[PDB]
Amino acid sequence: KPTPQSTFTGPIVVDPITRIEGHLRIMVEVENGKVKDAWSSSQLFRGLEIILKGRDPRDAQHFTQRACGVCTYVHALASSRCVDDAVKVSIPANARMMRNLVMASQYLHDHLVHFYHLHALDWVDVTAALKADPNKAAKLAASIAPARPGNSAKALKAVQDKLKAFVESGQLGIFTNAYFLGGHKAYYLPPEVDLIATAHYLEALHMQVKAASAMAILGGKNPHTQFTVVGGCSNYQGLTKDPLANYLALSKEVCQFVNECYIPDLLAVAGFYKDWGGIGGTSNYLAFGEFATDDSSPEKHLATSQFPSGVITGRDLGKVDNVDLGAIYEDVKYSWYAPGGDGKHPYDGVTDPKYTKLDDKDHYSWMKAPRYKGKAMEVGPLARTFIAYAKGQPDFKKVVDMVLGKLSVPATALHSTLGRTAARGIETAIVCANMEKWIKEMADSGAKDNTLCAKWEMPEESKGVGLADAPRGALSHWIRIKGKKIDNFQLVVPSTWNLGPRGAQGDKSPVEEALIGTPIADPKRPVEILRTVHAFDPCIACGVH
Amino acid sequence: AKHRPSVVWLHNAECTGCTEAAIRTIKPYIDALILDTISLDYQETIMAAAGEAAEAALHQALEGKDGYYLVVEGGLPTIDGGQWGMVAGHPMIETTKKAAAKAKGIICIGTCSAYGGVQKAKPNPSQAKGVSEALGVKTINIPGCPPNPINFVGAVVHVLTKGIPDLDENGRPKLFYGELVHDNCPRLPHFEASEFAPSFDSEEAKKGFCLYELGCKGPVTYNNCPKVLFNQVNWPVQAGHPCLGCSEPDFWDTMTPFYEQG
Ligand code: SF4
Ligand code: SF4
Ligand code: FCO
Ligand code: F3S
Ligand SMILES: [Mg+2]
Ligand code: NI
């Protein structure tokens, strides 16, 4: 029937929000079973911007990468771009290619882990998988997905047996007190679909190991790569034949799993949760672009990004504006910072921590509130997808239409939690479709010329910005150099955009806005809050740093 | 079914890089470990329950009849009574303190839990401390930023099947941290011959010369990196980059500047 909804009126708090990176507290007001107001409260401060002051600009990338071990690498990249810009060095073509491939590797690993190990348990009842008949499940998989041994009845039965023994032991481990135990109205999947997804969940645990190995061939190690330097990269071995053959091999495997399991699972889930095409929409989208053919400057990045940069307002796909890096600022009015810190451009950023109390609706987050000409901006896969689709980018046009057609929904249905979830898979598919081309580009370039790092000089005084679109969205690092040292170093991170608190106008952030209208089938077990929050792929260490 | 030992895993001031490191294990894989070997009964990053239900899962685990082992990821922020780092409205220091009080053993995964880590680097705005530093409980330290999964899983298995492994001064298992990075480095012949790369763009760098001039901290860092590799494929020096000394206490301040020697 209709989307299940209680008549519950009152507050709900979820803390901890699990299956994210970091420490999030969500508070909502509920009226007659629907969320009417929301607060996104980040619960940990570390202070990397404070820590960086006075240090060597060459050290920045090593501190900032520790902003996040889930989106590992991306902060080392943004810092390197930032410092490269500040000293005005243009990196060699091979360094641009190596840096962008490691980013492609990161998207693949990050997105697969998110769908399966962080997000899926909001949609898949694992214990209902035990009810499944493995033959029916094998027949369902056969018809919804490419044929594969791991989808056989024999395979699904093994998964079921393993799960049965685990559950029968009485130690449910990570499934203890799950919102789905004993059944739950907001969980719609047939037991067979639960089984298919559960088997793939287990498969994805092994596959993420391979995705990280691929990344490590070029990045030195994962987590926390160690191959970027001012002026380019250090990894000459990464330009050579045998490691690049291994890299392609592992990548092809990961992408096979993306095409065989991830996308089909995503499409099957979206099919049953069609109603979630009308829950959790926002209206503004921003991207700095990624995978640029010219990374010699911030300018050239925004212009030449293969996943294009852009700004969309009020859902208007007919009007994609250029990113005005001058119009970006951060507010602290509803944040745990010293008041009078509002409206600061990141070149002029101030990080002056000041705590009040838990659930102080005046000051309720360790995140700042980034705003673009006053407007809250959603960043991430859905942002990139809308901007690329509106701009007519051929891969996105073709993958989006495939999705919208398989689901029979208008493109407007994408402005929602379902769409946010679908866009993450969409772009994973597109990154996969480009891996071979990108790898061949660098293999050839690296065999004709192995130049990987340019010469450069530390200025007395400069500034620079490094832009990236990380898996969660638009990332920027901003540096002021004075006396050859870090005078100011500011991070503005995708989860700061998405999950930060209200701005100086009292205007809700994207996640707070997305949560308005959320139906709550069972206030005791509010899975619907999790579904929307997780769809934004929150990274709290990223957001606060 | 044979009872599997209960493991509670706490997240404090951290980047979740140590959790991510852990799940790159291949001997065994993460699924085999949590289905066959341990009962992982609280892990914020992957557990199904959230909010109150998750909190209840923790408290259930802490009250288990067969007891539990405690794994700690992250440092402890102590400023303002521990309020700059909170889970379920409780300071992380208070929760970790409770959990450490009845643990069979405490394993600190990562440089952050072991020694304080990145948030403790000067000027340490949150007054972050290592687990033993802040509480005075003795800990088994598995440092690195992040440690190799071989070192963490190996330590875990040893503790469950053999006893406490032999530890060095810094509470690290000698099994994994008994040797200098440098002593096992394939570039050691270049070091011995005074063949150093002067820059990353240099011919010396392209030829794989020693990285000591470029700040390599291998000579003062205890870890097994060149011996075991990461992700079965690589390590930083093989990727042409100096060691940062990331398994050493307070490396953020003792090993910086990273591209210089002391
Ligand atoms: S030791 Fe390093 S990887 Fe581990 S939580 Fe701390 S900063 Fe992150
Ligand atoms: S590269 Fe580093 S670890 Fe290797 S020999 Fe040189 S100083 Fe030692
Ligand atoms: N992706 C990612 Fe992490 C966040 N938010 C960064 O940058
Ligand atoms: S930086 Fe850390 S990972 Fe090993 S090579 Fe050096 S100890
Ligand atoms: Mg910031
Ligand atoms: Ni992150």
Tab-separated table of C-alpha atoms in Angstrom, chain A residues 13-23 25 43-48 50-52 55-56 58-59 61-63 65-70 109 113 117-118 121 162 165-166 168-169 171-180 201-202 205-206 208-209 212-213 216-224 226-230 233-237 246 250 353-358 366 449-451 453-455 524 530 541, chain B residues 1-6 11-18 20-21 23-26 29-32 34-36 38-57 60 77 80 83-90 92 118-126 145-147 200-202 205-206 230-236 238-244 246 251-253 256-260:
chain	number	residue	atom	x	y	z
A	13	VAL	CA	17.188	11.848	18.678
A	14	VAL	CA	19.546	9.406	16.879
A	15	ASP	CA	23.065	9.430	18.380
A	16	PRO	CA	25.198	7.678	17.420
A	17	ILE	CA	24.292	7.706	13.727
A	18	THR	CA	26.087	4.469	12.812
A	19	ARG	CA	27.304	3.244	9.413
A	20	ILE	CA	28.874	6.623	8.598
A	21	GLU	CA	32.351	7.971	9.190
A	22	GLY	CA	32.531	10.001	12.385
A	23	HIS	CA	30.288	11.248	15.153
A	25	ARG	CA	23.829	13.363	16.306
A	43	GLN	CA	29.904	15.772	17.850
A	44	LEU	CA	33.725	15.759	17.443
A	45	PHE	CA	36.325	18.553	16.940
A	46	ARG	CA	40.047	17.915	16.177
A	47	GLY	CA	41.255	21.250	14.787
A	48	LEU	CA	43.615	20.494	11.894
A	50	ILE	CA	44.699	25.294	14.050
A	51	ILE	CA	47.405	22.574	14.087
A	52	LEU	CA	48.747	23.599	10.634
A	55	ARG	CA	54.169	24.745	9.866
A	56	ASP	CA	56.011	23.966	6.573
A	58	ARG	CA	55.169	20.897	2.287
A	59	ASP	CA	53.872	19.158	5.423
A	61	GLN	CA	49.193	17.257	2.731
A	62	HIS	CA	50.325	14.803	5.401
A	63	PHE	CA	48.332	16.380	8.203
A	65	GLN	CA	45.014	13.511	4.673
A	66	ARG	CA	44.249	12.473	8.263
A	67	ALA	CA	41.069	14.516	8.089
A	68	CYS	CA	39.625	11.191	6.821
A	69	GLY	CA	40.688	7.545	6.335
A	70	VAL	CA	37.482	6.612	4.503
A	109	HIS	CA	36.405	1.673	-3.435
A	113	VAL	CA	31.735	0.089	0.466
A	117	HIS	CA	28.429	-1.921	4.143
A	118	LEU	CA	27.044	1.451	5.210
A	121	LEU	CA	21.172	-2.367	5.947
A	162	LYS	CA	26.553	-19.488	7.082
A	165	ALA	CA	24.720	-20.818	11.894
A	166	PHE	CA	25.743	-17.216	12.821
A	168	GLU	CA	21.596	-19.584	15.681
A	169	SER	CA	24.724	-19.018	17.805
A	171	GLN	CA	25.912	-13.786	19.154
A	172	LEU	CA	24.486	-11.441	16.481
A	173	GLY	CA	27.544	-9.141	16.558
A	174	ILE	CA	27.076	-6.197	14.194
A	175	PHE	CA	23.367	-7.184	13.745
A	176	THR	CA	22.544	-6.864	17.469
A	177	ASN	CA	19.402	-4.776	18.055
A	178	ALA	CA	19.099	-4.143	14.284
A	179	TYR	CA	16.072	-2.024	13.323
A	180	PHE	CA	14.850	-4.906	11.137
A	201	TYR	CA	27.383	-7.772	0.812
A	202	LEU	CA	29.740	-10.582	1.806
A	205	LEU	CA	33.913	-7.332	1.748
A	206	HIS	CA	36.431	-9.253	-0.384
A	208	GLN	CA	36.927	-3.815	-1.541
A	209	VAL	CA	40.256	-5.450	-0.699
A	212	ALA	CA	42.217	-0.840	-2.381
A	213	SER	CA	45.085	-2.970	-3.800
A	216	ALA	CA	47.929	1.099	-3.657
A	217	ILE	CA	49.821	0.239	-6.844
A	218	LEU	CA	49.804	3.965	-7.718
A	219	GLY	CA	49.360	5.415	-4.199
A	220	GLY	CA	51.972	3.392	-2.242
A	221	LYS	CA	49.437	2.142	0.359
A	222	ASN	CA	45.783	2.308	1.447
A	223	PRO	CA	44.670	3.689	3.753
A	224	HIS	CA	46.635	6.946	3.526
A	226	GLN	CA	52.123	8.454	0.100
A	227	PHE	CA	52.990	9.302	-3.549
A	228	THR	CA	52.121	13.005	-4.004
A	229	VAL	CA	54.696	15.809	-3.638
A	230	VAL	CA	54.801	19.534	-4.455
A	233	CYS	CA	54.264	12.641	-7.833
A	234	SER	CA	57.111	10.469	-6.563
A	235	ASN	CA	55.985	7.102	-7.957
A	236	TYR	CA	58.083	6.386	-11.051
A	237	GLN	CA	57.327	2.644	-10.754
A	246	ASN	CA	48.253	-5.431	-12.496
A	250	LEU	CA	42.407	-5.540	-10.497
A	353	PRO	CA	36.359	26.798	18.876
A	354	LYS	CA	33.812	27.602	21.570
A	355	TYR	CA	31.523	24.933	23.001
A	356	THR	CA	28.182	25.630	24.698
A	357	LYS	CA	26.002	22.648	25.554
A	358	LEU	CA	24.428	19.577	24.011
A	366	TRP	CA	31.265	21.521	15.274
A	449	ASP	CA	58.391	10.126	-21.204
A	450	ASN	CA	58.690	9.336	-17.478
A	451	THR	CA	58.674	12.963	-16.136
A	453	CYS	CA	57.586	16.022	-10.895
A	454	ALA	CA	58.259	19.645	-11.926
A	455	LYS	CA	60.788	22.062	-10.380
A	524	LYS	CA	11.228	3.176	18.254
A	530	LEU	CA	19.026	6.739	8.520
A	541	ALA	CA	35.850	13.984	10.476
B	1	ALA	CA	28.061	-23.635	18.449
B	2	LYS	CA	31.391	-22.774	20.113
B	3	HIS	CA	31.283	-19.343	21.853
B	4	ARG	CA	33.367	-16.624	20.159
B	5	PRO	CA	35.243	-14.031	22.275
B	6	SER	CA	33.434	-10.703	22.644
B	11	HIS	CA	35.762	5.270	18.156
B	12	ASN	CA	37.176	8.435	19.771
B	13	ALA	CA	39.120	11.304	18.103
B	14	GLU	CA	39.920	9.486	14.846
B	15	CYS	CA	39.645	9.487	10.991
B	16	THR	CA	38.405	5.861	10.803
B	17	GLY	CA	41.569	5.003	8.815
B	18	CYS	CA	42.354	2.328	11.405
B	20	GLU	CA	39.506	0.810	7.180
B	21	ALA	CA	42.990	-0.679	7.605
B	23	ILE	CA	39.095	-4.567	6.964
B	24	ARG	CA	41.865	-4.993	4.381
B	25	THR	CA	42.832	-8.182	6.255
B	26	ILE	CA	43.221	-11.294	4.055
B	29	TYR	CA	39.258	-11.830	5.555
B	30	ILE	CA	37.064	-9.618	7.724
B	31	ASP	CA	33.960	-11.800	7.265
B	32	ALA	CA	35.666	-15.025	8.404
B	34	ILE	CA	33.729	-11.872	12.598
B	35	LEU	CA	31.769	-15.053	11.743
B	36	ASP	CA	34.309	-17.703	13.005
B	38	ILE	CA	35.501	-13.164	17.395
B	39	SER	CA	32.109	-11.736	18.248
B	40	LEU	CA	32.355	-8.091	17.250
B	41	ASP	CA	29.598	-6.659	19.426
B	42	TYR	CA	29.989	-2.910	18.931
B	43	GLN	CA	31.528	-1.107	15.913
B	44	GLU	CA	29.968	2.243	14.989
B	45	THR	CA	31.179	2.144	11.362
B	46	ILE	CA	29.472	-1.141	10.365
B	47	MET	CA	26.864	-2.069	13.001
B	48	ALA	CA	23.167	-2.296	12.014
B	49	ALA	CA	21.703	-0.614	15.130
B	50	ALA	CA	21.844	3.158	15.643
B	51	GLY	CA	21.139	5.658	18.442
B	52	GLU	CA	19.574	4.231	21.594
B	53	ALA	CA	19.527	0.688	20.106
B	54	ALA	CA	23.316	0.941	19.437
B	55	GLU	CA	23.934	2.359	22.907
B	56	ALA	CA	22.008	-0.578	24.379
B	57	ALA	CA	24.148	-2.938	22.239
B	60	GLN	CA	24.803	-5.257	26.684
B	77	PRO	CA	39.974	14.972	23.784
B	80	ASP	CA	36.060	21.215	28.692
B	83	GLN	CA	32.909	17.656	25.702
B	84	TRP	CA	34.605	18.288	22.339
B	85	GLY	CA	34.254	14.565	21.587
B	86	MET	CA	30.910	13.021	22.458
B	87	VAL	CA	28.990	9.853	21.617
B	88	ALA	CA	25.315	9.478	22.713
B	89	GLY	CA	25.743	12.635	24.844
B	90	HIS	CA	28.691	11.177	26.812
B	92	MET	CA	34.492	9.833	24.895
B	118	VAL	CA	47.196	13.965	14.821
B	119	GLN	CA	44.802	15.920	17.101
B	120	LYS	CA	47.560	15.968	19.773
B	121	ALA	CA	50.059	17.746	17.458
B	122	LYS	CA	50.916	21.315	18.564
B	123	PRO	CA	49.170	23.305	19.707
B	124	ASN	CA	46.697	20.485	20.601
B	125	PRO	CA	43.498	22.620	20.804
B	126	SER	CA	41.272	19.794	22.187
B	145	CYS	CA	48.768	5.866	10.716
B	146	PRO	CA	47.214	3.486	10.032
B	147	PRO	CA	48.813	0.176	11.131
B	200	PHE	CA	61.912	14.014	-6.646
B	201	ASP	CA	62.427	15.185	-10.226
B	202	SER	CA	66.086	14.025	-10.242
B	205	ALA	CA	65.118	9.566	-7.815
B	206	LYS	CA	64.197	7.909	-11.137
B	230	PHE	CA	50.548	-2.863	2.144
B	231	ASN	CA	47.576	-4.237	0.150
B	232	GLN	CA	49.880	-7.082	-0.961
B	233	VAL	CA	51.488	-4.698	-3.525
B	234	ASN	CA	53.481	-1.690	-2.276
B	235	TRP	CA	54.900	0.529	0.447
B	236	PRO	CA	55.753	4.265	0.543
B	238	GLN	CA	58.774	1.576	-3.136
B	239	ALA	CA	56.389	4.340	-4.337
B	240	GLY	CA	59.350	6.736	-4.232
B	241	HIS	CA	58.328	8.606	-1.077
B	242	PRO	CA	60.161	8.989	2.276
B	243	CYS	CA	58.879	7.291	5.447
B	244	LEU	CA	57.120	9.784	7.765
B	246	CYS	CA	54.082	7.252	11.419
B	251	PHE	CA	55.673	11.706	15.148
B	252	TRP	CA	53.629	14.738	14.007
B	253	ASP	CA	56.000	16.840	16.094
B	256	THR	CA	58.469	17.155	11.133
B	257	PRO	CA	59.491	18.791	8.891
B	258	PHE	CA	58.752	15.615	6.889
B	259	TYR	CA	61.067	16.437	3.956
B	260	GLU	CA	64.033	17.298	6.239
